[PDB]
Design an enzyme around this catalytic site. Sequence first.
Site, PDB file in Angstrom:
ATOM      1  N   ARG A 252       0.860  -1.208   0.000  1.00 38.92           N
ATOM      2  CA  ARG A 252       0.000   0.000   0.000  1.00 38.92           C
ATOM      3  C   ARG A 252       0.884   1.243   0.000  1.00 38.92           C
ATOM      4  O   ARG A 252       0.415   2.276  -0.485  1.00 38.92           O
ATOM      5  CB  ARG A 252      -0.944  -0.037   1.203  1.00 38.92           C
TER       6      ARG A 252
ATOM      7  N   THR B  87       6.024   7.787  11.874  1.00 39.50           N
ATOM      8  CA  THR B  87       5.798   8.777  12.950  1.00 39.50           C
ATOM      9  C   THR B  87       6.916   9.827  12.872  1.00 39.50           C
ATOM     10  O   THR B  87       8.103   9.452  12.964  1.00 39.50           O
ATOM     11  CB  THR B  87       5.744   8.084  14.316  1.00 39.50           C
TER      12      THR B  87
ATOM     13  N   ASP C 137       2.330  23.518  13.691  1.00 38.71           N
ATOM     14  CA  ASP C 137       2.628  22.670  12.508  1.00 38.71           C
ATOM     15  C   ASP C 137       2.306  23.451  11.225  1.00 38.71           C
ATOM     16  O   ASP C 137       1.190  24.003  11.125  1.00 38.71           O
ATOM     17  CB  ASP C 137       1.835  21.371  12.536  1.00 38.71           C
TER      18      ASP C 137
ATOM     19  N   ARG D 251      13.565  29.111  -0.919  1.00 32.92           N
ATOM     20  CA  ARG D 251      13.072  29.951   0.194  1.00 32.92           C
ATOM     21  C   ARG D 251      14.201  30.062   1.225  1.00 32.92           C
ATOM     22  O   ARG D 251      14.738  28.993   1.665  1.00 32.92           O
ATOM     23  CB  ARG D 251      11.793  29.336   0.774  1.00 32.92           C
TER      24      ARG D 251
ATOM     25  N   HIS E  88      16.280  32.443   6.290  1.00 35.06           N
ATOM     26  CA  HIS E  88      15.346  33.068   7.265  1.00 35.06           C
ATOM     27  C   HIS E  88      15.565  32.497   8.666  1.00 35.06           C
ATOM     28  O   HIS E  88      15.733  31.269   8.812  1.00 35.06           O
ATOM     29  CB  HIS E  88      13.870  32.851   6.849  1.00 35.06           C
TER      30      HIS E  88
ATOM     31  N   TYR F 196       7.117  21.491   8.765  1.00 36.05           N
ATOM     32  CA  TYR F 196       7.943  21.825   9.946  1.00 36.05           C
ATOM     33  C   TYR F 196       7.092  22.212  11.141  1.00 36.05           C
ATOM     34  O   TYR F 196       5.972  22.767  10.987  1.00 36.05           O
ATOM     35  CB  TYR F 196       9.062  22.793   9.597  1.00 36.05           C
TER      36      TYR F 196
ATOM     37  N   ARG G 298      10.998  39.451  -0.772  1.00 40.01           N
ATOM     38  CA  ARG G 298      11.884  39.447   0.407  1.00 40.01           C
ATOM     39  C   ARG G 298      13.255  38.878   0.000  1.00 40.01           C
ATOM     40  O   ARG G 298      14.288  39.508   0.333  1.00 40.01           O
ATOM     41  CB  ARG G 298      11.195  38.694   1.547  1.00 40.01           C
TER      42      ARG G 298
HETATM   43  N1  LIG Z   1      -2.278  32.146   5.946  1.00 38.87           N
HETATM   44  C1  LIG Z   1      -0.982  32.007   6.334  1.00 38.87           C
HETATM   45  N2  LIG Z   1      -0.066  32.925   5.921  1.00 38.87           N
HETATM   46  C2  LIG Z   1       1.242  32.792   6.335  1.00 38.87           C
HETATM   47  C3  LIG Z   1       1.659  31.677   7.181  1.00 38.87           C
HETATM   48  N3  LIG Z   1       2.981  31.772   7.409  1.00 38.87           N
HETATM   49  C4  LIG Z   1       3.406  32.867   6.765  1.00 38.87           C
HETATM   50  N4  LIG Z   1       2.376  33.467   6.139  1.00 38.87           N
HETATM   51  C5  LIG Z   1       2.499  34.678   5.310  1.00 38.87           C
HETATM   52  O1  LIG Z   1       3.192  34.255   4.117  1.00 38.87           O
HETATM   53  C6  LIG Z   1       4.046  35.303   3.615  1.00 38.87           C
HETATM   54  C7  LIG Z   1       5.494  34.861   3.319  1.00 38.87           C
HETATM   55  O2  LIG Z   1       6.157  34.574   4.550  1.00 38.87           O
HETATM   56  P1  LIG Z   1       7.720  34.280   4.693  1.00 38.87           P
HETATM   57  O3  LIG Z   1       7.911  33.979   6.161  1.00 38.87           O
HETATM   58  O4  LIG Z   1       8.450  35.491   4.116  1.00 38.87           O
HETATM   59  O5  LIG Z   1       7.740  32.918   3.819  1.00 38.87           O
HETATM   60  P2  LIG Z   1       8.976  32.025   3.220  1.00 38.87           P
HETATM   61  O6  LIG Z   1       9.723  33.003   2.319  1.00 38.87           O
HETATM   62  O7  LIG Z   1       8.407  30.803   2.535  1.00 38.87           O
HETATM   63  O8  LIG Z   1       9.805  31.547   4.403  1.00 38.87           O
HETATM   64  C8  LIG Z   1       3.950  36.402   4.692  1.00 38.87           C
HETATM   65  O9  LIG Z   1       3.081  37.431   4.199  1.00 38.87           O
HETATM   66  C9  LIG Z   1       3.368  35.762   5.940  1.00 38.87           C
HETATM   67  O10 LIG Z   1       2.560  36.637   6.740  1.00 38.87           O
HETATM   68  C10 LIG Z   1       0.635  30.717   7.581  1.00 38.87           C
HETATM   69  O11 LIG Z   1       0.969  29.714   8.309  1.00 38.87           O
HETATM   70  N5  LIG Z   1      -0.631  30.933   7.112  1.00 38.87           N
HETATM   71  N1  LIG Z   2       7.650   2.042  12.213  1.00 36.13           N
HETATM   72  C1  LIG Z   2       6.330   2.294  12.346  1.00 36.13           C
HETATM   73  N2  LIG Z   2       5.469   1.268  12.164  1.00 36.13           N
HETATM   74  C2  LIG Z   2       4.149   1.500  12.307  1.00 36.13           C
HETATM   75  C3  LIG Z   2       3.663   2.853  12.631  1.00 36.13           C
HETATM   76  N3  LIG Z   2       2.339   2.803  12.702  1.00 36.13           N
HETATM   77  C4  LIG Z   2       1.980   1.523  12.423  1.00 36.13           C
HETATM   78  N4  LIG Z   2       3.062   0.742  12.193  1.00 36.13           N
HETATM   79  C5  LIG Z   2       3.005  -0.713  11.867  1.00 36.13           C
HETATM   80  O1  LIG Z   2       2.362  -0.775  10.586  1.00 36.13           O
HETATM   81  C6  LIG Z   2       1.506  -1.926  10.467  1.00 36.13           C
HETATM   82  C7  LIG Z   2       0.060  -1.611  10.055  1.00 36.13           C
HETATM   83  O2  LIG Z   2      -0.683  -1.023  11.125  1.00 36.13           O
HETATM   84  P1  LIG Z   2      -2.182  -0.417  10.905  1.00 36.13           P
HETATM   85  O3  LIG Z   2      -2.480   0.488  12.094  1.00 36.13           O
HETATM   86  O4  LIG Z   2      -3.049  -1.615  10.644  1.00 36.13           O
HETATM   87  O5  LIG Z   2      -2.071   0.480   9.555  1.00 36.13           O
HETATM   88  P2  LIG Z   2      -3.235   0.978   8.522  1.00 36.13           P
HETATM   89  O6  LIG Z   2      -3.726  -0.329   7.898  1.00 36.13           O
HETATM   90  O7  LIG Z   2      -2.456   1.902   7.595  1.00 36.13           O
HETATM   91  O8  LIG Z   2      -4.323   1.719   9.287  1.00 36.13           O
HETATM   92  C8  LIG Z   2       1.646  -2.596  11.812  1.00 36.13           C
HETATM   93  O9  LIG Z   2       2.736  -3.499  11.705  1.00 36.13           O
HETATM   94  C9  LIG Z   2       2.124  -1.554  12.778  1.00 36.13           C
HETATM   95  O10 LIG Z   2       2.791  -2.201  13.873  1.00 36.13           O
HETATM   96  C10 LIG Z   2       4.648   3.933  12.800  1.00 36.13           C
HETATM   97  O11 LIG Z   2       4.291   5.120  13.085  1.00 36.13           O
HETATM   98  N5  LIG Z   2       5.936   3.574  12.617  1.00 36.13           N
END
Ligand SMILES: Nc1nc2c(ncn2[C@@H]2O[C@H](COP(=O)(O)OP(=O)(O)O)[C@@H](O)[C@H]2O)c(=O)[nH]1
Ligand SMILES: Nc1nc2c(ncn2[C@@H]2O[C@H](COP(=O)(O)OP(=O)(O)O)[C@@H](O)[C@H]2O)c(=O)[nH]1
Lengths: 178, 181
Positions: free
Chosen positions: B28, B33, B53, B64, B67, B134, B172
């Site tokens: 698949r 993680t 995130d 890019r 920064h 990131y 920038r």
């Molecule tokens: N909606 C939204 N805008 C963002 C985010 N992060 C940055 N921006 C905007 O994106 C633009 C570019 O940001 P910059 O930090 O210079 O981006 P980079 O050059 O990719 O590192 C800026 O106007 C920020 O205000 C975000 O997570 N969401």
């Molecule tokens: N290394 C690693 N193995 C994982 C992770 N998550 C699940 N597995 C293994 O992947 C296999 C499938 O698990 P499952 O939860 O049924 O996956 P799904 O079918 O994609 O929902 C099992 O062997 C788990 O032990 C992970 O984050 N890292």
Amino acid sequence: MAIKFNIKESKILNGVYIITPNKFSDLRGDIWTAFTDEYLSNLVPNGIKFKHDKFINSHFNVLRGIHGDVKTYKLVTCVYGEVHQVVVDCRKDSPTYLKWEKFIISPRNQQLILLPPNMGNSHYVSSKEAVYYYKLAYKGEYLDAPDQFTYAWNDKRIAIDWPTNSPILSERDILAMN
Amino acid sequence: MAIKFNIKESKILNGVYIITPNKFSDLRGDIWTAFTDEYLSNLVPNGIKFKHDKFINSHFNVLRGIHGDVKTYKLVTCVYGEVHQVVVDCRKDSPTYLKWEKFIISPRNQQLILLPPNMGNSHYVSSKEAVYYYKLAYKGEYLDAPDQFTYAWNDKRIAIDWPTNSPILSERDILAMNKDK
Ligand SMILES: Nc1nc2c(ncn2[C@@H]2O[C@H](COP(=O)(O)OP(=O)(O)O)[C@@H](O)[C@H]2O)c(=O)[nH]1
Ligand SMILES: Nc1nc2c(ncn2[C@@H]2O[C@H](COP(=O)(O)OP(=O)(O)O)[C@@H](O)[C@H]2O)c(=O)[nH]1
Ligand SMILES: [Cl-]
């Protein structure tokens, strides 16, 4: 541009939230925030915190599910390609027990879906490849396969609309058919 | 297969860590993680939390950077396609000020890099399209572009090896080239 989210509860399954972030788009591509504590942590009660980030890469026509456990909240999306994300109500005492809701998620429809515990989680890859991003909120230890339940993708009581009758399935998901 | 991380410090820049996860692979595709509090929250000082995130989707030949800011810890990787990830040491009083290290990150080479604050973060897209993930750990509010520093991608002091001489750049990152013009 400030970081924003549109946040609404599902009209079909109680406890399921649909979260849409804004994006800064330019000639280079797109920047967006998937999650911050301050903005989204208040959606999850009883002290449970997001502490786990996972990625699942999959080929066209792969279907993983229907998987769930008794304690984990999940925040799911597709950050490359496209998936049929299906949430099933697996709470036996819920009035919508074995009802379901589909979200076709991609970079062009960037919804993040919040599932409470004891819910069925599944997705079908409708693109050549997809990357599924998956945040987990839970107390204690990660519940791997042996500590999860499984409903069959094709369960006749749930009767989910899937784009195929022959998906690419794991042994766990095949064995759920019988 | 239990979730595993390998952590090791850069041999080139003090305080930069290179994180390597295991993966479950089958017909698949792949499961892995990127982060758990249990294994990776120690990367960063106590009182400071990964709470943010971000995804950055970019086209081939986009660059890019460079920064950074005074307070933000960054955990960086590429979850689709391929980037030239370059960490610059921008700590003025460090014995490696304006030295740099390159990581070619992709699903085939699934590495996550920990940058402490006062470092330059930069990446070049060597794939058709890339998805850069990131995590940020900082106290108080997010420092947006106006509260960050910028070094030119092609700063002669840093002298980074990039695969291009003419990247796709923001306003920038172009203006940063023009400082002594
Ligand atoms: N909606 C939204 N805008 C963002 C985010 N992060 C940055 N921006 C905007 O994106 C633009 C570019 O940001 P910059 O930090 O210079 O981006 P980079 O050059 O990719 O590192 C800026 O106007 C920020 O205000 C975000 O997570 N969401
Ligand atoms: N290394 C690693 N193995 C994982 C992770 N998550 C699940 N597995 C293994 O992947 C296999 C499938 O698990 P499952 O939860 O049924 O996956 P799904 O079918 O994609 O929902 C099992 O062997 C788990 O032990 C992970 O984050 N890292
Ligand atoms: Cl369908």
